[model samples]
Target chain A: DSEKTRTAILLAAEELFLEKGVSHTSLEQIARAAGVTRGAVYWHFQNKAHLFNEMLNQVRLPPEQLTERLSSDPLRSLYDLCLEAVQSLLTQEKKRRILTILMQRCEFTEELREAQERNNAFVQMFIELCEQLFARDECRVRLHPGMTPRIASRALHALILGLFNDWLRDPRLFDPDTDAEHLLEPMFRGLVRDW
Target chain B: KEDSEKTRTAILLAAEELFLEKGVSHTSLEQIARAAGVTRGAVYWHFQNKAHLFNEMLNQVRLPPEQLTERLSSDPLRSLYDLCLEAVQSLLTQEKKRRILTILMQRCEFTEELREAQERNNAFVQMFIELCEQLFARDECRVRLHPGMTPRIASRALHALILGLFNDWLRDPRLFDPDTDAEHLLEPMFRGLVRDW
Candidate 1:
């Protein structure tokens, strides 16, 4: 009952947050939409920021799986992981809605400092992970001279983030699932020495 | 004599801060008026609404044509690359560019009220894309492009890279050391485009 009630609250919050941007939606509104008491909403989330973080966590990929993939054959794995993630975000309705809410609908104010830090830390860890992958022997040999792992890592991160931000900004702007390779292939070839 | 001009600048600066502190749509003319220390009428007199005020805020960061086109006429590749670098540098160094862009990219939501503002931004992006595409289409720059790569594809690719770098860095200051690292950061994609460098 607790799990079901928790899920119900989240679903209602998602709909409200989507309809009225995160900044505008209230816990009471979410509670009303969920057919639950404000007490139930508070029970599930400490506050709006906690609730927002939980909402993002719903769609965010688990970090452990990410760590494993980067542990071996990172270059190819990075590409594959990105492709899968982007496709999932685009194809999965729930994931897309939450992402749209986060990327397009939500605004970061001082109130969201904790949520912002959580997201920023997640992103930084991923960057550092990519940096480690680039530092690998197999990966190191591929990069063009004078190019270090840091820059290479940033390049890949930038492409993925760019693809997400631009496409999310407006689907008419660019197609992420279709244009992914066209955007990434030449880039990989340039960054890696052999390709 | 210049009181109005100074007032306008003050309005924009205050608006940028407020827009960033609160989302653009959430920040009203009255708040901007109060922050700018001008009457609400003054704010409305200078700009029709938030959209108009938003547009004026962006114009402060936008690159002028003469400087850009004049450089392109001499050396297309260098100018395009320089222009690209300069754009990143401007966002890196200028508080106005960074704040205005933050508002446009994240603070403002694209709804019916903001459709005009969104369209204006899209048009500006299109112009930039067409500019880069034209450079790639030229024989001088075209010859430099990697085999089988067209101007359109390369231009879109470059645009995405810049967008990602800009948004990511702004989100976290630690993400990029913009002053020293901009050139190296831009290298890989351009290297892909023109392998010689």
Candidate 2:
């Protein structure tokens, strides 16, 4: 019962966040959409900020899943993992709603520092994760002579960032389904030798 | 300068300063009026509301339609590279643009009131896609493409990379030494797209 109510609250919050925006949408509005009392919302979430964070986590990869995937294959898995994420963003409705809300709707105002920090930190970690793959002694051999893991990973992170952020803004500019796999290969190929 | 002109100038500068420092969604007209030393009436008289003010703020920094097309290149490859460079060189060279673009990319929320502003972005993005298509359809730029890559795909990739650099650098300017890393990171990606080797 609690889980269902939580889903209702989150999904309703997602819709409002997408439609009205994070800062503009109120907890009262969310409670109404979720078909629950404001009290139930309070029970489920301490506040709107907590609810917002939970909404964003809907799209994030679980830590364990990311760990296992990256560990399984050194260089390939990094690209594979990103590709899978791109696929989800393209295909999954719930994921798409949250991503659009995060990238397009939510502005990093003072009241929402936590969400902004959480996002930036997650991206920093992902960039570092890609750096680890490239900097590994085995993987280093594949890098172009002048390239460092730092620069290479920065480029990779930016590429994915560009796709998600840009695609969300204008779908006509990018077809997420094929574009991620298509664009990412040449990018990886450019970085890694003998791929 | 006329008194109204001075008030207008104050308002724009104050808006930009706070918009950069506090973010668009966070800043308000009351704060802008105080920062400008103008009354609330003056601020409202100058710009319709925050949405209109924000839109006009962007207009001052935007390139005219003919701006990009003015400098034509004989070599399509050189032309495409030049187009990409022109697209972002301002963020490196122009301080006003750097701040405004940062807010647009990072701070503004595209709520219903601001959805019209989003349409303007869509128009710019479309213009870029068409520019890429024009270059690729020309036999010269297309010659560089690898086996199966199409102009549509290549241009889209280029568009994304351009925006990526814009957003990433704006995320924290210090991370990228723009003068040094600009060409180095971008060139390889384009090369990978066109050249088989």
Candidate 3:
């Protein structure tokens, strides 16, 4: 019963927080939006700050699980898995708005910055997993002679971030699914000199 | 009525000149009023605030849809290529204002209203996409059409190519000729979308 109520409140709060920025939204408004009493909201989370932290943690946890699932074949899995992630995250209207708000909030607020840093840490883990996979399958996936794995990993991360930012700016102007499928081969080719 | 309109025109022109030179943050209302030969109260009466004035200036910069659509559709391929060249040349020519805008956006000094104003300032890309869709629809185009390629991706790619090249240009504007190199940059993008014949 408590978990159900908690999830509902979080969903409502997130929607409200995004629609009305964090500075403008109040706990009472969140309670009303969630269709719950203020007491019910407090019963699940101590405060708005705690609730926000929980929401961020919830959003970040699944991507890590998805990354783990793709760790089997880093190069191939990473390309596809990242594409799937980008398609879902960038294409959906609600998610795109929320992400843009989050990115903007990260610019001004320390709390949002910490949340973003945690998100970056998760991405780094995925990058590390890819590094291990490349190490094991050097013959299958070759880096350019001068390209260090670290730099390659950073480049991939930047590409994903850059593409995601572009997607967010105008979803009507970008579709990640096509970009992924079309780019995967060229990206793969670029990585491996003679694939 | 005539005086009111003239006052508004003066304020806008002064704001644009000052903003281009000293930037939005650095250019105060008092300075704008002094430069426009109007009282500070007059400036405030005409526009709510600095942000409002900046947005109006931005609205002036936005390309009209009809103009963009006509130019882009006139010769989609050639126009797209030329657009890239012109954009690069414009950046080089107006490096001062370009750098100022870049700094303004990077510093996050521009609020949501300013961001929206700036983002909507480019109508060329949307028109470019309209033309691209037409070109891709042609059977004689001889370009590979990836099953999933959408107008949005094409537009973003065009945007990315320009932005990426602009970044390079900011470092060394004369190092690359956007006119000659624009087509080179587009080759891989076209190849990526098309099935290799």
Candidate 4:
């Protein structure tokens, strides 16, 4: 019953966050929407900021899980990892909902400091992981001349941000199913050799 | 001294300050007015609405065509690289430009009221892509393009790299140094897209 109440509160919070911007949405509204008392909402989340952070955590896959998915080439592993993440946006409405909330619906102000930090920490983790992958000797040598592991990781991270941001802003801009491949493949080919 | 142009400049400046701090969606013309030290009517007189005011703020940083043309005039292929580097360098050095772009890229949301601003921003990207498309279409540059790539795709690929760098850096400046790493980060994409970089 306690877990059910918590899930209900998060679901309701997501709906309200999507409809009304984060700043405008109140915890009371979330409680009311979830058909729970304010005390129960408080029992789960200390405040709206905490709830927002938890919502984001739902979508993050830990690096260990991702690392286990790697096949042969480190570069290919990185590329597949990224491609699958973007493709997930299509079928996973809840994932899309939370990302849209994070990417566009919410604003990063002083009040949401913790949530922003948590989100950014994930970004830092991914980039560092990418750097290690590219730093592998075989992977490092495949990179075009003048391209260092550091730059390669940053560039790939940037392209992923671009694809996600652009597509999230306007889905019609590019279809993730077809255009995602075209849009993302070139960056990979451009970044390394023997792909 | 109540000069019209001075009042307009003041309103734009104030809007930038509030938008950067409070975000575009949260900020209001009244707040912008008080910050500008003018009446709300004065804010309305210069710009029709928040969307128009936002557009004017963006217009301040629109790319100068003459400078872009000048870059491509000499060595077209190398110009693309220089053009990207110069743009990032300029973005880093110009504090005001950086702030305004931060507002656009990070602070603002494109709700219904700001739909016009979103379309304008999209058009700006289109203009940039088209400009690069022409350069890629050029005989000298076209031959240099890698196989399985057309002029349009080539231009879009480069635009993605440029845009990604701007957005990523603005989101987290600690990620990479734009000063030293920009060229190294950009070169691989260029090498991949073009046969001989």
Candidate 5:
């Protein structure tokens, strides 16, 4: 069936892109690996860029699910989920390599920039989540007397990006899960009322 | 010995200037030769390609970490204060700042052949972490307020703070003098983030 063949091509393309890098791998090679003709590959996707964009979308967390999940505890749960998501994504070595390659390419490509913007909806959800969590009647943590939830959330996002940048460069430097735990403990204590 | 070293220094200076003015991708071998007052053959004699030449330029331009580490090892808190002052004063040249930030931002753009180059760029940060852990291990530095804070957390926090400041400086260096405000940024962490506390 054409549907089955198309699915196989997508999987094969992802594997090869991961192994050879997006810049290095060729469409012909992907076609051969997929056991599909060049025309078949073209029939499903416009070009290598289109296929890569599809791959980015495939790996991203659905915004609705992320919003629902982070809508609960906000700070703690969101940080923990971010750690878990990145850790899970990095578990597959090839996927991790592909992600690193894509991150590098972000500066050069408009499409990649748009893809990054789409993926960053998670950040907006995080901002909203923090506001809800910190505003609860029974909340233990209190921000700086006049600190706005938006400001605190922005700071947290910047910190996450900074840490993630380091982690991507060298996983040995920071264990995402462990580092998240360490950050949350001090962060919550520093913000919470009963300190 | 002096003549050879001078020639090498001339070549490096010329390369750094050209590369900063025009990115590595745009600059060429012939132009580098012209800028250095040397022939193309002479340029090839020292380096293989543009990439090799650029890598060496980065090596020559970056500050040596050993002195900073030694100072930090001697006195942990004072070292932090002093290093920030020194970084602002000595290492904040426009070319040096642009090259360092650009290299970090674009390191992953290199293919597999240059993977080691990327790794080498990150060594300074790792060295800083080791220095922090050693200082903490010796009980030379105490966590005054947050008693339960671990060395790893402390190191990450310190790194994050420095990185945040560096990012801010890169955007607008004149807004805050690293000499005066460098230690001032640490006040929140030292005083505690929560207002009541």
Candidate 6:
């Protein structure tokens, strides 16, 4: 019952947060929509920031799986992982909603400091992970001349972020369905000696 | 009711302050009215609604798309690079533009109400990309592109890189200095796509 109630609260929160922007949605409102008492909502989550972080966690890759993927074939796995992320946005309704909320529907304010920190940390960790992979001996030799692992990591992160942000804002600009390879492959090719 | 232009200017300035301090979705016209020392009706008279006001606010810093075309009359590729540098430098030099961009890029959410603002914003982006596509499609530039790249893809990549840099820098200005490091960061993509580079 406790687990079920928690899931219900999260679903209601996502729906309300989608309908009304995150800054405007309230825990009480979420509780009301969830058909649960405010006490129950509080029992499951500390506050809006905590709840927001947990909601984001639902769609994120498990750390272990991501580590394994990157461990075996650093550059290749990273590229495929990025493609999978774009595909997930197209296929997974929950991922689409949450990411849409994150990218387009939420703002970072004083109240959301915790969630903001978590998000920033997540971004940094991903970049650092890429940096590590790019720095490896086998992968390091494959980078194009004048391309450092650091810049490559940032460039890939930025490109992916740009694609996600732009596509979410206006789907007409870049088609993830047919144009993913056309768009993503160039950056990878430019960064690596061989694709 | 009194000094119409003054009233409009006041509302606009007040809205910027509030929008900077409070996220756009959290701020309202009534709040803007109080901050501006004007009546709620005055805010309405100056602007139709929140989205309209938001669009007006954006127009304050937006460059006319035609400006890029006129500036690129000579050495299209070099002119585009210089234009990008100037665009980024303006964000650093101009405080108001930086604040508004921060609001646009981070502080606001585009929900149903801001659909008009979003559409207007996308129109500017589309116009810019189309102009770049034209530049890339020119005979001189067309021959320079690496194989597997087209005018459309190059233009899209250029837009993506510029936008990506904006998002990254705004998120953390410490990431890279726009003054010294901007060209270095931009050169790789150009070097990658252009065969001569």
- The 0-to-1 C-alpha lDDT of every candidate, in the order given, reads 0.81, 0.79, 0.57, 0.81, 0.58, 0.84
Residue pairs clashing in model 5 are: A141-A192
lDDT tens readout by residue for model 5, A6-88: 77887887777555555456678889999889988888876776677666665656767776776544556765775675465
A106-188: candidate 1 lDDT, tens digit per residue: 77877677888898888888899989988988889888888888888887788778877767766775566776667776678
Model 3 chain B poorest 10 in a row by lDDT: B102-111
The count of backbone overlaps in candidate 2 is 0
Candidate 5 chain A, run of 10 with poorest lDDT: A104-113
The best-first sequence of candidates by lDDT reads 6, 4, 1, 2, 5, 3
Please tell me which predicted candidate would have the highest DockQ against the true structure.
Answer: 2
Candidate 6: tens digits of C-alpha lDDT, residues B1-197: 56788888889899999988878988999999999999999899889899999999999999887677798765678888888878866768889988999999888988898999999999999988889888889999989887778888778777787787788778777666777666666666676677776
* Distance from true location, Cα of B130 in model 2, Å: 1.5
Q: How accurately is candidate 2 docked according to DockQ?
A: 0.57
lDDT by residue for model 1 over B81-193, one digit each (tens)? 77778877777678877888888776766655566776787778777777788878988778887777788778888888888888888887787787777787887788888
| CAPRI-style docking class of model 1 based on DockQ | medium
Shift in Å, residue B26, candidate 5: 10
DockQ of each: 0.53, 0.57, 0.07, 0.50, 0.16, 0.54
Instruction: Please identify model 1 stretches exceeding 4 Å from their true place.
Output: B1-3, B64-70, B73-75, B111-113
lDDT of model 5 at position B119: 61
Q: Write down the TM-score of model 1's second chain.
A: 0.91
Interface RMSD (Å), each candidate?
Answer: 1.8, 1.6, 7.1, 1.9, 5.1, 1.7
Task: Give all TM-scores, in the order shown.
Answer: 0.92, 0.90, 0.56, 0.91, 0.68, 0.92
Fnat per predicted structure, each in turn? 0.46, 0.46, 0.04, 0.39, 0.11, 0.38
Write model 4 residue lDDT over B1-197, tens digit each, in one string: 56788989989999999999988878889999999999999888889899889999998988767766677765687888888887877667888889999988878766666778878888787777778889989998888877777776667667777887898899899888878888887777777777766
- Give the per-residue lDDT of model 3 (tens digit) for B1-197: 99899999899888766765544545688999999999999999998777667666655544566676577653355565566567656654665456544433322232343555445433444555566666556554424455665544544554554554454343334434544544443344444445451
TM (chain A), candidate 5: 0.70
Question: Model 4, range A16-50, lDDT digits (tens) per residue?
Answer: 88876687788899999999999988879998888
Which one wins on lDDT? 6
Write the residue-wise lDDT of candidate 3 on A53-155 in tens digits: 6776664546557657755345677667667767777456656655665533222233344454465567667667655555665533466554445434443
